[PDB]
């Protein structure tokens, strides 16, 4: 669960990748507790793990 909503008020939400830049830090509805993650095309987060 990696992409841009709120059930609770909105149901749908996006971004743009000129917002992540560098950064690409974790977010929330300005108005709610719904937590999301700020992706453009790849609607995850990531792991950088090791095999
Ligand atoms: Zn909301």
Redesign the pocket.
Known sequence: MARFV?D???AQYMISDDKIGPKGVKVR?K??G?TITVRPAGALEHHHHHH
């Open positions: 709120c609770s008020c909105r509805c108005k709610c719904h």
